[PDB]
Design a protein around this nucleic acid. Sequence first.
DNA 1: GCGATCAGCG
DNA 2: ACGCTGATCGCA
Length: 579
Amino acid sequence: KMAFTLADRVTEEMLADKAALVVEVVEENYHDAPIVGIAVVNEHGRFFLRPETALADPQFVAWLGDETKKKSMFDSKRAAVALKWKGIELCGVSFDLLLAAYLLDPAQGVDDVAAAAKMKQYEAVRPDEAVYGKGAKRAVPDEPVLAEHLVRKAAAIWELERPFLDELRRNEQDRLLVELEQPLSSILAEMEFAGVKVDTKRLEQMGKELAEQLGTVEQRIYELAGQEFNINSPKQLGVILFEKLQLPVLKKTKTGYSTSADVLEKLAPYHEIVENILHYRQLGKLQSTYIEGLLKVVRPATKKVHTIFNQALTQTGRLSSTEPNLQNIPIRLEEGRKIRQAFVPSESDWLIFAADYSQIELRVLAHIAEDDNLMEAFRRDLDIHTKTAMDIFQVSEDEVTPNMRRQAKAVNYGIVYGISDYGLAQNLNISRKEAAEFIERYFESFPGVKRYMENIVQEAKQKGYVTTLLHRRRYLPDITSRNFNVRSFAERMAMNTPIQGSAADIIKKAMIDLNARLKEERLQAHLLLQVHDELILEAPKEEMERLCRLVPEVMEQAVTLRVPLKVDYHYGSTWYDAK
DNA sequence: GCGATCAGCG
DNA sequence: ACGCTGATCGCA
Ligand SMILES: [Ca+2]
């Protein structure tokens, strides 16, 4: 019901200098995954290609790698990375319908061409799920069904570029797509394909020593509990703590007794068992997620892990990392932080270089709210978290422990993002009127932040959305809901999203500037990971001293704010040592 | 499949 | 009753 050529060979009219291209990878994880078909729509017509012929044709391969041949795509990072696993470079992507839909409305959840197309009343294409099936029924259909689905996606992309571009322009989002999100997409592709090298012997050795500490703590719990149980069974664990040992019930869940770490810490005066249960969970988390979980996804021949950075998922414009998540590798507890010793450079006498922004979101907040005292504090490079710990625990800067600082950190962001006196008292273990008086005092010193929090909520009520400094957008229909709880959650989104989102815009700008600068200095250094406000690279040890001057400066100059941006940096033999 | 939980980011 | 995530696991 749509006309196209089922092509055998590649012809010159398939290689026009502007086209919609579909390079279909059905597997969710596209690393080293099969390419099942190719479709091209251009001025000359519509074409389906079998990949075993087009990807071995030198004229088609050259066309893919020629940046003057412009391609409109959906999810071009997926195609680019699977092509790299075929030894093929894709260049010239001038429109990515996934990123365009994500900028226009991140809450759509647009996961395929049909879902983006529906945004513009275009419906002559089917959902990917209806063509391939789901779960155990997933299959590549017969070639004519596949060829028509891929051509319909390409024709949809061909039609939808212009209406998407013109709405992006009306939102002031068109330079965000073309100068930020599309260039970042190619940089993520390289990072994911390069991967990160893992010391599997060291990981395996820690997993052995963990399995032995786990058993010990486990017997000390059973003995403290009188009997044995499934320490992972909330039914059983709840029965032990709040019936057998008769500990107080401080919190319930929708299913029963709460056993979260916040509760278990408040019960430590009552019984020694709760601190052993905490230690047990922590050692079990390291074992399942970060030992077994990481060994499960290492590619054995190279000892590399290849994450996928989802660029069109978070409601704020942050990235996320999946399979493995390399953005939540432990760091705070000493036992967990040693996991970072297994992350090593991919070549001998290379090193890991990490740089990160200091207090990025409070600096963004200072700039956006134009708070006099908050701006002045950062013009003095004050460490607000340490300063806040001193104020809370009535100590000196000498006696600010890392746990007090991390505590003050949660208070600093909590207050500006709408923490209540109740919530503050539960976090500090102070009375509820002391928490409220503290909150009033903090807004006495930063009235401009208070004003911004009110202004941004009223602006979200009247506009229907909030924006970031580079014009990312988030719609907030619930901001006018009549239900008090639903409306309150939306108000705190209006306070938080412009700040977190602007901080995501800034570090994405830095990654793009950094790559251009690495290239102009002809350095071998390349990005491996982004962790929200941190960039991790690897480079020959001979480039470290240049990177100590280049990277901080690039990051600090990514944008110009009314306060300076501050960047800390370390390097060494493993990720562990690069802090 | 989902909720509770916990690892990270602010 | 601060916000944004992803992984594991039990299942109330
Ligand atoms: Ca930081």
